[PDB]
């Protein structure tokens, strides 16, 4: 009965979080902010480039001009773009390629709901461009996760209502974003991190078309 599946990139399709964290931590340390650790990164997980930089600057109560803000964001992005040059189809998470093919076969729309402006480049690196009907443009999204914005945009991009879609995420902020969009969340990870009120799978191999069809019938 569902018309679309809204995929986040990070933690669902491949791991980009680790590279992003290292690049943000490196930037923070260059400008004297040493508080960007794995604990603080939970507030940074899945969040846009601009909102992630502002949260890092707020940690040390640092004031910058608009030109300086854009220079810091560009500096980190250049570092991140270098880190991901070697991303290949071998980096696609287990079960994801088969799920995409099975959704395409059943005429179910596929959309990306990532806050990353590097999303199209990453799907190209992984040879997944053809499997996506639409990619939610983060440049046209005014609020980062937990806000529903990116997931609403992902659904509208494929011509469907969020209530007619399933959202896949690995983060708490992302799951809340799917809930608030109207879409049905199916998380990948642990209940203590993602929530006890949603359907959760331990890893991406469990994300099959038949599992998604069953979760939707049981809602
Ligand atoms: O727009 P990017 O800089 O490529 O990516 C932005 O969104 C992604 C979501 O996976 C991460 O939160 C990253 O830290 C952030 O900067
Ligand atoms: Mg994610």
PDB file of C-alpha atoms and ligand atoms in Angstrom:
ATOM      1  CA  UNK A   1       0.000   0.000   0.000  1.00  0.00           C
ATOM      2  CA  UNK A   2       2.974   2.393   0.549  1.00  0.00           C
ATOM      3  CA  UNK A   3       3.955   4.483  -2.467  1.00  0.00           C
ATOM      4  CA  UNK A   4       7.492   5.526  -1.476  1.00  0.00           C
ATOM      5  CA  UNK A   5      10.515   4.761   0.693  1.00  0.00           C
ATOM      6  CA  UNK A   6      12.523   7.744   1.951  1.00  0.00           C
ATOM      7  CA  UNK A   7      16.134   6.719   2.555  1.00  0.00           C
ATOM      8  CA  UNK A   8      18.623   8.668   4.614  1.00  0.00           C
ATOM      9  CA  UNK A   9      22.171   8.239   3.260  1.00  0.00           C
ATOM     10  CA  UNK A  10      24.169   7.921   6.482  1.00  0.00           C
ATOM     11  CA  UNK A  11      23.791   4.644   8.399  1.00  0.00           C
ATOM     12  CA  UNK A  12      21.294   3.206   5.929  1.00  0.00           C
ATOM     13  CA  UNK A  13      23.016   3.265   2.518  1.00  0.00           C
ATOM     14  CA  UNK A  14      26.626   3.709   3.759  1.00  0.00           C
ATOM     15  CA  UNK A  15      28.652   5.181   6.641  1.00  0.00           C
ATOM     16  CA  UNK A  16      29.396   8.881   6.104  1.00  0.00           C
ATOM     17  CA  UNK A  17      29.100   9.879   9.805  1.00  0.00           C
ATOM     18  CA  UNK A  18      32.625   8.735  10.659  1.00  0.00           C
ATOM     19  CA  UNK A  19      34.196  10.882   7.899  1.00  0.00           C
ATOM     20  CA  UNK A  20      31.983  13.882   8.787  1.00  0.00           C
ATOM     21  CA  UNK A  21      32.847  13.608  12.493  1.00  0.00           C
ATOM     22  CA  UNK A  22      36.617  13.461  11.796  1.00  0.00           C
ATOM     23  CA  UNK A  23      36.411  16.442   9.430  1.00  0.00           C
ATOM     24  CA  UNK A  24      34.340  18.492  11.928  1.00  0.00           C
ATOM     25  CA  UNK A  25      36.658  17.529  14.806  1.00  0.00           C
ATOM     26  CA  UNK A  26      39.702  18.564  12.735  1.00  0.00           C
ATOM     27  CA  UNK A  27      38.106  21.953  11.904  1.00  0.00           C
ATOM     28  CA  UNK A  28      37.093  22.538  15.529  1.00  0.00           C
ATOM     29  CA  UNK A  29      40.634  21.778  16.745  1.00  0.00           C
ATOM     30  CA  UNK A  30      42.167  24.207  14.202  1.00  0.00           C
ATOM     31  CA  UNK A  31      40.089  27.088  15.634  1.00  0.00           C
ATOM     32  CA  UNK A  32      40.687  26.123  19.281  1.00  0.00           C
ATOM     33  CA  UNK A  33      37.494  24.144  20.071  1.00  0.00           C
ATOM     34  CA  UNK A  34      38.398  20.763  21.624  1.00  0.00           C
ATOM     35  CA  UNK A  35      34.912  19.648  22.689  1.00  0.00           C
ATOM     36  CA  UNK A  36      33.853  17.835  19.507  1.00  0.00           C
ATOM     37  CA  UNK A  37      33.988  14.230  20.743  1.00  0.00           C
ATOM     38  CA  UNK A  38      31.747  11.206  19.983  1.00  0.00           C
ATOM     39  CA  UNK A  39      29.369  12.273  22.785  1.00  0.00           C
ATOM     40  CA  UNK A  40      28.912  15.799  21.343  1.00  0.00           C
ATOM     41  CA  UNK A  41      28.579  14.276  17.839  1.00  0.00           C
ATOM     42  CA  UNK A  42      25.132  12.914  18.807  1.00  0.00           C
ATOM     43  CA  UNK A  43      23.874  16.527  18.536  1.00  0.00           C
ATOM     44  CA  UNK A  44      25.629  16.759  15.130  1.00  0.00           C
ATOM     45  CA  UNK A  45      24.342  13.450  13.680  1.00  0.00           C
ATOM     46  CA  UNK A  46      22.334  13.909  10.460  1.00  0.00           C
ATOM     47  CA  UNK A  47      22.329  17.715  10.794  1.00  0.00           C
ATOM     48  CA  UNK A  48      23.068  20.118   7.870  1.00  0.00           C
ATOM     49  CA  UNK A  49      26.497  21.674   7.217  1.00  0.00           C
ATOM     50  CA  UNK A  50      25.473  25.166   8.388  1.00  0.00           C
ATOM     51  CA  UNK A  51      23.622  23.990  11.512  1.00  0.00           C
ATOM     52  CA  UNK A  52      26.491  21.635  12.462  1.00  0.00           C
ATOM     53  CA  UNK A  53      29.047  24.484  12.236  1.00  0.00           C
ATOM     54  CA  UNK A  54      26.865  26.816  14.332  1.00  0.00           C
ATOM     55  CA  UNK A  55      26.514  24.167  17.094  1.00  0.00           C
ATOM     56  CA  UNK A  56      30.327  23.737  17.183  1.00  0.00           C
ATOM     57  CA  UNK A  57      30.833  27.533  17.368  1.00  0.00           C
ATOM     58  CA  UNK A  58      28.214  27.755  20.173  1.00  0.00           C
ATOM     59  CA  UNK A  59      30.166  25.183  22.237  1.00  0.00           C
ATOM     60  CA  UNK A  60      32.996  27.702  22.772  1.00  0.00           C
ATOM     61  CA  UNK A  61      30.658  30.731  22.344  1.00  0.00           C
ATOM     62  CA  UNK A  62      32.598  31.859  19.245  1.00  0.00           C
ATOM     63  CA  UNK A  63      31.450  34.877  17.197  1.00  0.00           C
ATOM     64  CA  UNK A  64      32.161  34.973  13.438  1.00  0.00           C
ATOM     65  CA  UNK A  65      31.207  37.127  10.433  1.00  0.00           C
ATOM     66  CA  UNK A  66      29.138  35.686   7.535  1.00  0.00           C
ATOM     67  CA  UNK A  67      32.286  35.533   5.345  1.00  0.00           C
ATOM     68  CA  UNK A  68      34.220  33.745   8.112  1.00  0.00           C
ATOM     69  CA  UNK A  69      31.310  31.307   8.672  1.00  0.00           C
ATOM     70  CA  UNK A  70      31.288  30.361   4.968  1.00  0.00           C
ATOM     71  CA  UNK A  71      35.096  29.975   4.970  1.00  0.00           C
ATOM     72  CA  UNK A  72      34.984  27.552   7.934  1.00  0.00           C
ATOM     73  CA  UNK A  73      32.163  25.511   6.324  1.00  0.00           C
ATOM     74  CA  UNK A  74      34.108  25.396   3.035  1.00  0.00           C
ATOM     75  CA  UNK A  75      37.318  24.332   4.833  1.00  0.00           C
ATOM     76  CA  UNK A  76      35.591  21.315   6.418  1.00  0.00           C
ATOM     77  CA  UNK A  77      33.734  20.431   3.200  1.00  0.00           C
ATOM     78  CA  UNK A  78      37.001  20.420   1.199  1.00  0.00           C
ATOM     79  CA  UNK A  79      38.446  17.996   3.780  1.00  0.00           C
ATOM     80  CA  UNK A  80      35.321  15.790   3.630  1.00  0.00           C
ATOM     81  CA  UNK A  81      35.222  15.758  -0.212  1.00  0.00           C
ATOM     82  CA  UNK A  82      38.841  14.451  -0.183  1.00  0.00           C
ATOM     83  CA  UNK A  83      37.948  11.686   2.312  1.00  0.00           C
ATOM     84  CA  UNK A  84      35.125  10.351   0.111  1.00  0.00           C
ATOM     85  CA  UNK A  85      36.861  10.229  -3.297  1.00  0.00           C
ATOM     86  CA  UNK A  86      37.455   6.482  -2.983  1.00  0.00           C
ATOM     87  CA  UNK A  87      33.880   5.520  -1.985  1.00  0.00           C
ATOM     88  CA  UNK A  88      32.792   2.647  -4.245  1.00  0.00           C
ATOM     89  CA  UNK A  89      29.876   0.128  -4.675  1.00  0.00           C
ATOM     90  CA  UNK A  90      31.663  -2.108  -2.115  1.00  0.00           C
ATOM     91  CA  UNK A  91      30.748   0.485   0.545  1.00  0.00           C
ATOM     92  CA  UNK A  92      26.977   0.023   0.047  1.00  0.00           C
ATOM     93  CA  UNK A  93      25.478  -1.546   3.193  1.00  0.00           C
ATOM     94  CA  UNK A  94      24.255  -5.210   3.045  1.00  0.00           C
ATOM     95  CA  UNK A  95      20.760  -5.680   1.610  1.00  0.00           C
ATOM     96  CA  UNK A  96      20.424  -2.084   0.343  1.00  0.00           C
ATOM     97  CA  UNK A  97      21.118  -2.780  -3.366  1.00  0.00           C
ATOM     98  CA  UNK A  98      18.652  -5.720  -3.355  1.00  0.00           C
ATOM     99  CA  UNK A  99      15.994  -3.602  -1.550  1.00  0.00           C
ATOM    100  CA  UNK A 100      16.344  -0.784  -4.135  1.00  0.00           C
ATOM    101  CA  UNK A 101      16.002  -3.263  -7.021  1.00  0.00           C
ATOM    102  CA  UNK A 102      12.949  -4.893  -5.393  1.00  0.00           C
ATOM    103  CA  UNK A 103      11.237  -1.507  -4.826  1.00  0.00           C
ATOM    104  CA  UNK A 104      11.929  -0.497  -8.451  1.00  0.00           C
ATOM    105  CA  UNK A 105      10.454  -3.830  -9.636  1.00  0.00           C
ATOM    106  CA  UNK A 106       7.269  -3.181  -7.630  1.00  0.00           C
ATOM    107  CA  UNK A 107       6.955   0.409  -8.988  1.00  0.00           C
ATOM    108  CA  UNK A 108       7.543   1.903  -5.513  1.00  0.00           C
ATOM    109  CA  UNK A 109       9.179   5.353  -5.523  1.00  0.00           C
ATOM    110  CA  UNK A 110      12.677   5.806  -4.083  1.00  0.00           C
ATOM    111  CA  UNK A 111      13.824   9.091  -2.525  1.00  0.00           C
ATOM    112  CA  UNK A 112      16.852  10.340  -0.612  1.00  0.00           C
ATOM    113  CA  UNK A 113      16.222  12.297   2.583  1.00  0.00           C
ATOM    114  CA  UNK A 114      19.760  13.315   3.513  1.00  0.00           C
ATOM    115  CA  UNK A 115      20.882  16.698   4.853  1.00  0.00           C
ATOM    116  CA  UNK A 116      24.125  16.243   2.871  1.00  0.00           C
ATOM    117  CA  UNK A 117      24.760  18.474  -0.179  1.00  0.00           C
ATOM    118  CA  UNK A 118      27.260  15.766  -1.156  1.00  0.00           C
ATOM    119  CA  UNK A 119      24.413  13.232  -1.393  1.00  0.00           C
ATOM    120  CA  UNK A 120      24.266  13.077  -5.262  1.00  0.00           C
ATOM    121  CA  UNK A 121      28.069  12.654  -5.501  1.00  0.00           C
ATOM    122  CA  UNK A 122      27.992   9.793  -2.962  1.00  0.00           C
ATOM    123  CA  UNK A 123      25.183   7.907  -4.761  1.00  0.00           C
ATOM    124  CA  UNK A 124      27.226   8.304  -7.985  1.00  0.00           C
ATOM    125  CA  UNK A 125      30.351   6.902  -6.264  1.00  0.00           C
ATOM    126  CA  UNK A 126      28.282   3.893  -5.206  1.00  0.00           C
ATOM    127  CA  UNK A 127      26.629   3.545  -8.662  1.00  0.00           C
ATOM    128  CA  UNK A 128      23.154   4.069  -7.138  1.00  0.00           C
ATOM    129  CA  UNK A 129      22.076   7.202  -9.081  1.00  0.00           C
ATOM    130  CA  UNK A 130      19.783   5.228 -11.399  1.00  0.00           C
ATOM    131  CA  UNK A 131      17.854   3.662  -8.495  1.00  0.00           C
ATOM    132  CA  UNK A 132      16.777   7.026  -7.066  1.00  0.00           C
ATOM    133  CA  UNK A 133      13.724   8.798  -8.474  1.00  0.00           C
ATOM    134  CA  UNK A 134      14.470  11.957  -6.478  1.00  0.00           C
ATOM    135  CA  UNK A 135      16.893  13.471  -3.976  1.00  0.00           C
ATOM    136  CA  UNK A 136      15.661  16.006  -1.399  1.00  0.00           C
ATOM    137  CA  UNK A 137      17.736  19.164  -1.905  1.00  0.00           C
ATOM    138  CA  UNK A 138      19.081  20.355   1.497  1.00  0.00           C
ATOM    139  CA  UNK A 139      19.709  23.839   0.061  1.00  0.00           C
ATOM    140  CA  UNK A 140      15.902  24.185  -0.134  1.00  0.00           C
ATOM    141  CA  UNK A 141      15.371  22.823   3.423  1.00  0.00           C
ATOM    142  CA  UNK A 142      15.213  25.415   6.241  1.00  0.00           C
ATOM    143  CA  UNK A 143      15.485  23.125   9.280  1.00  0.00           C
ATOM    144  CA  UNK A 144      17.634  20.108  10.155  1.00  0.00           C
ATOM    145  CA  UNK A 145      16.582  16.843  11.844  1.00  0.00           C
ATOM    146  CA  UNK A 146      14.620  16.390  14.336  1.00  0.00           C
ATOM    147  CA  UNK A 147      12.592  18.759  12.110  1.00  0.00           C
ATOM    148  CA  UNK A 148      10.438  16.864   9.509  1.00  0.00           C
ATOM    149  CA  UNK A 149      11.458  19.160   6.609  1.00  0.00           C
ATOM    150  CA  UNK A 150      13.865  16.886   4.706  1.00  0.00           C
ATOM    151  CA  UNK A 151      11.477  13.884   4.827  1.00  0.00           C
ATOM    152  CA  UNK A 152       8.470  15.988   3.721  1.00  0.00           C
ATOM    153  CA  UNK A 153      10.600  17.326   0.837  1.00  0.00           C
ATOM    154  CA  UNK A 154      11.752  13.775  -0.087  1.00  0.00           C
ATOM    155  CA  UNK A 155       8.137  12.583  -0.367  1.00  0.00           C
ATOM    156  CA  UNK A 156       6.966  15.639  -2.350  1.00  0.00           C
ATOM    157  CA  UNK A 157       9.939  15.212  -4.696  1.00  0.00           C
ATOM    158  CA  UNK A 158       8.551  11.819  -5.806  1.00  0.00           C
ATOM    159  CA  UNK A 159       4.947  13.093  -5.932  1.00  0.00           C
ATOM    160  CA  UNK A 160       3.635  11.303  -2.833  1.00  0.00           C
ATOM    161  CA  UNK A 161       2.328  12.340   0.598  1.00  0.00           C
ATOM    162  CA  UNK A 162       4.563  11.566   3.639  1.00  0.00           C
ATOM    163  CA  UNK A 163       1.683   9.511   5.131  1.00  0.00           C
ATOM    164  CA  UNK A 164       1.984   7.223   2.072  1.00  0.00           C
ATOM    165  CA  UNK A 165       5.713   6.636   2.737  1.00  0.00           C
ATOM    166  CA  UNK A 166       8.172   4.656   4.875  1.00  0.00           C
ATOM    167  CA  UNK A 167      11.295   6.345   6.255  1.00  0.00           C
ATOM    168  CA  UNK A 168      14.574   4.542   6.961  1.00  0.00           C
ATOM    169  CA  UNK A 169      16.977   5.932   9.585  1.00  0.00           C
ATOM    170  CA  UNK A 170      19.721   4.992  12.071  1.00  0.00           C
ATOM    171  CA  UNK A 171      19.571   8.085  14.308  1.00  0.00           C
ATOM    172  CA  UNK A 172      17.206   9.340  17.024  1.00  0.00           C
ATOM    173  CA  UNK A 173      16.861  12.802  15.416  1.00  0.00           C
ATOM    174  CA  UNK A 174      16.136  11.211  12.053  1.00  0.00           C
ATOM    175  CA  UNK A 175      13.481   8.855  13.479  1.00  0.00           C
ATOM    176  CA  UNK A 176      11.724  11.840  15.104  1.00  0.00           C
ATOM    177  CA  UNK A 177      11.899  13.642  11.741  1.00  0.00           C
ATOM    178  CA  UNK A 178      10.117  10.696  10.048  1.00  0.00           C
ATOM    179  CA  UNK A 179       7.451  10.522  12.810  1.00  0.00           C
ATOM    180  CA  UNK A 180       6.758  14.255  12.540  1.00  0.00           C
ATOM    181  CA  UNK A 181       6.608  14.112   8.719  1.00  0.00           C
ATOM    182  CA  UNK A 182       3.714  11.670   8.834  1.00  0.00           C
ATOM    183  CA  UNK A 183       5.756   8.790   7.402  1.00  0.00           C
ATOM    184  CA  UNK A 184       6.235   5.380   9.014  1.00  0.00           C
ATOM    185  CA  UNK A 185       9.687   4.969  10.655  1.00  0.00           C
ATOM    186  CA  UNK A 186      11.673   1.722  10.522  1.00  0.00           C
ATOM    187  CA  UNK A 187      14.959   2.134  12.323  1.00  0.00           C
ATOM    188  CA  UNK A 188      18.280   0.332  12.069  1.00  0.00           C
ATOM    189  CA  UNK A 189      20.128   0.063  15.343  1.00  0.00           C
ATOM    190  CA  UNK A 190      19.195  -0.321  19.020  1.00  0.00           C
ATOM    191  CA  UNK A 191      15.933   0.601  20.926  1.00  0.00           C
ATOM    192  CA  UNK A 192      17.798   2.481  23.699  1.00  0.00           C
ATOM    193  CA  UNK A 193      19.172   4.854  21.044  1.00  0.00           C
ATOM    194  CA  UNK A 194      16.262   5.056  18.555  1.00  0.00           C
ATOM    195  CA  UNK A 195      13.147   4.532  20.699  1.00  0.00           C
ATOM    196  CA  UNK A 196      10.892   1.758  22.028  1.00  0.00           C
ATOM    197  CA  UNK A 197       7.792   2.832  20.042  1.00  0.00           C
ATOM    198  CA  UNK A 198       9.104   2.048  16.527  1.00  0.00           C
ATOM    199  CA  UNK A 199       9.940  -1.091  14.514  1.00  0.00           C
ATOM    200  CA  UNK A 200      13.736  -1.626  14.626  1.00  0.00           C
ATOM    201  CA  UNK A 201      16.066  -4.022  12.801  1.00  0.00           C
ATOM    202  CA  UNK A 202      19.597  -4.859  14.116  1.00  0.00           C
ATOM    203  CA  UNK A 203      21.281  -4.279  10.710  1.00  0.00           C
ATOM    204  CA  UNK A 204      20.419  -3.261   7.108  1.00  0.00           C
ATOM    205  CA  UNK A 205      20.206  -6.836   5.710  1.00  0.00           C
ATOM    206  CA  UNK A 206      16.821  -7.085   7.450  1.00  0.00           C
ATOM    207  CA  UNK A 207      15.523  -4.189   5.297  1.00  0.00           C
ATOM    208  CA  UNK A 208      13.780  -6.320   2.643  1.00  0.00           C
ATOM    209  CA  UNK A 209      10.699  -5.451   0.549  1.00  0.00           C
ATOM    210  CA  UNK A 210       8.685  -8.175   2.286  1.00  0.00           C
ATOM    211  CA  UNK A 211       9.655  -6.909   5.743  1.00  0.00           C
ATOM    212  CA  UNK A 212       8.627  -3.343   4.788  1.00  0.00           C
ATOM    213  CA  UNK A 213       5.341  -4.670   3.340  1.00  0.00           C
ATOM    214  CA  UNK A 214       4.612  -6.581   6.559  1.00  0.00           C
ATOM    215  CA  UNK A 215       5.422  -3.610   8.861  1.00  0.00           C
ATOM    216  CA  UNK A 216       3.059  -1.441   6.785  1.00  0.00           C
ATOM    217  CA  UNK A 217       0.204  -3.993   7.024  1.00  0.00           C
ATOM    218  CA  UNK A 218       0.661  -4.219  10.817  1.00  0.00           C
ATOM    219  CA  UNK A 219       0.472  -0.397  11.300  1.00  0.00           C
TER     220      UNK A 219
HETATM  221  O1  LIG B   1      26.123  18.879   3.480  1.00  0.00           O
HETATM  222  P1  LIG B   1      27.364  18.001   3.926  1.00  0.00           P
HETATM  223  O2  LIG B   1      28.477  18.999   4.478  1.00  0.00           O
HETATM  224  O3  LIG B   1      27.952  17.162   2.726  1.00  0.00           O
HETATM  225  O4  LIG B   1      26.727  17.038   5.102  1.00  0.00           O
HETATM  226  C1  LIG B   1      25.933  17.546   6.164  1.00  0.00           C
HETATM  227  O5  LIG B   1      24.871  16.562   6.416  1.00  0.00           O
HETATM  228  C2  LIG B   1      25.353  15.247   6.808  1.00  0.00           C
HETATM  229  C3  LIG B   1      24.162  14.297   6.996  1.00  0.00           C
HETATM  230  O6  LIG B   1      24.698  13.023   6.750  1.00  0.00           O
HETATM  231  C4  LIG B   1      26.146  15.330   8.112  1.00  0.00           C
HETATM  232  O7  LIG B   1      25.346  15.767   9.263  1.00  0.00           O
HETATM  233  C5  LIG B   1      27.315  16.359   7.883  1.00  0.00           C
HETATM  234  O8  LIG B   1      28.084  16.508   9.065  1.00  0.00           O
HETATM  235  C6  LIG B   1      26.776  17.697   7.433  1.00  0.00           C
HETATM  236  O9  LIG B   1      27.876  18.635   7.209  1.00  0.00           O
HETATM  237 MG1  LIG B   2      21.128   8.256   9.312  1.00  0.00          MG
END
